[PDB]
Design an enzyme around this catalytic site. Structure first.
Site, PDB file in Angstrom:
ATOM      1  N   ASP A 156      20.954  85.345 -14.721  1.00 40.60           N
ATOM      2  CA  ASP A 156      21.880  84.780 -15.669  1.00 40.60           C
ATOM      3  C   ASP A 156      21.612  83.265 -15.852  1.00 40.60           C
ATOM      4  O   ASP A 156      21.948  82.431 -15.010  1.00 40.60           O
ATOM      5  CB  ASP A 156      23.295  84.910 -15.086  1.00 40.60           C
ATOM      6  CG  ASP A 156      24.282  84.270 -15.944  1.00 40.60           C
ATOM      7  OD1 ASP A 156      23.954  84.076 -17.139  1.00 40.60           O
ATOM      8  OD2 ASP A 156      25.458  83.998 -15.454  1.00 40.60           O
TER       9      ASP A 156
ATOM     10  N   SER B 104      19.387  75.033 -32.605  1.00 46.27           N
ATOM     11  CA  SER B 104      18.592  75.719 -33.584  1.00 46.27           C
ATOM     12  C   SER B 104      18.652  74.975 -34.889  1.00 46.27           C
ATOM     13  O   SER B 104      19.635  74.381 -35.250  1.00 46.27           O
ATOM     14  CB  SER B 104      19.149  77.162 -33.752  1.00 46.27           C
ATOM     15  OG  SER B 104      18.516  77.866 -34.815  1.00 46.27           O
TER      16      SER B 104
END
Lengths: 330, 7
Positions: A35, A199
């Site tokens: 994780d 992004s």
């Protein structure tokens, strides 16, 4: 040094991936969920309340000659859905894929919440976010990666998650045969302890690319892609019959529908998520409503590039003094 | 279930 381990989906939907980890001497092999959105290595154990264990493999420190109680240390964590676990701490030898760390803090659960008990395939979690998030008190502990770094050939790990198939976590090297084209690197902010990046925009299907900054985290421990409501609505608008269902808890769509791809930008480069990767199947057995793999982050407070996005790429987690993230097509 | 690994 280096390590390489195969990670396997726990089910036919790729809801999570498990990787075998050796703990102790002789080795006890547990299947952990790696994780990148948390920083605790914790396991079901011989100390876990018996009624809270249903099928999981447990770590038994008394059977490990290398285990030592980390006296006075406790830990307690909650995740994004409110699931939680807590316990005490041992140090022991931990190996992944051939890469060994001695004196790793292994957090032994005394208590785990219901959603953990109910998943017999996940024996614990191995956190790969920054060690500033580690919950051990009074003395915070380092992640497996932070402990291994100085021994590694290069201070990196890579995630190559499969679509309906196994993938690979590599430590210490970049396997140049595992991706196509080039790897585009982008800046990371560690201010919140996550692999946080921005992004450069998105496209739905064959549509025009929309240049827009979307800040979010790379979280291997999250199944789906969670993005701003604007973006998500623009996606689902291109699927006949799709809608946001309050009762179900997100966008659903007719099982008969074909889904468009979703593209995200990484710098001047583009990662395409095929439509098939966005289908999470019927909401309940036998339903003709299917759950979407792109969902709104509006309730959460952060955008999350979870497995739906990450499995479309070869992802490099560069833990150099100034961390960066790399993405390649594959 | 879906997974959501720490806020």
């Amino acid at each position: 040094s280096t390590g390489s381990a195969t990670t396997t989906p726990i089910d036919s939907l790729d809801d999570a991936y498990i990787t075998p980890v050796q703990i102790g001497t002789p080795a006890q092999t547990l299947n952990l969920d790696f994780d990148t959105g948390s920083s605790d290595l914790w396991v079901f154990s011989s100390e876990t309340t018996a009624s809270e264990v249903d099928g999981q493999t447990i770590y038994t420190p008394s059977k490990s000659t290398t285990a030592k109680l980390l006296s006075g240390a406790t830990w307690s964590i909650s995740y994004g859905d409110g699931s939680s676990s807590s316990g005490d701490v041992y140090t022991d030898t931990v190996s992944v894929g051939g890469l060994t760390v001695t004196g790793q803090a292994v957090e032994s659960a005394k208590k785990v919440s219901s959603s953990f008990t109910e998943d017999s395939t996940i024996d614990g979690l191995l956190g790969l976010a920054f060690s500033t998030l580690n919950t051990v008190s009074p003395t915070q502990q380092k992640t497996f990666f932070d402990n291994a770094k100085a021994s590694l050939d290069s201070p990196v790990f890579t995630a190559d998650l499969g679509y309906h198939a196994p993938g690979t976590y590599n430590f210490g090297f970049i396997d140049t045969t595992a991706y196509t084209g080039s790897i585009t690197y982008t800046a990371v902010s560690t201010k919140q302890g996550f692999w946080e990046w921005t992004s450069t925009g998105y496209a739905v299907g064959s549509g025009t690319f929309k240049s827009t900054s979307i800040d979010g985290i790379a979280d291997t421990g999250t199944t789906l892609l969670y993005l701003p409501a604007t973006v998500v609505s623009a996606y689902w608008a291109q699927v006949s019959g799709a809608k946001s269902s309050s009762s179900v808890g997100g966008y659903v769509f007719p099982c008969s529908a074909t889904l468009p791809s979703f593209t995200f930008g990484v710098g001047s480069a583009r990662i395409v998520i095929p439509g098939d990767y966005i289908d999470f199947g019927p909401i309940s057995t036998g339903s003709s409503s299917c759950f979407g793999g792109i969902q709104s982050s509006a309730g959460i407070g952060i955008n999350i590039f979870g497995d739906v996005a990450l499995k479309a790429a070869f992802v490099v987690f560069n833990g150099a003094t100034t961390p960066t993230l790399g993405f390649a097509s594959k | 279930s879906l997974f959501h690994x720490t806020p």
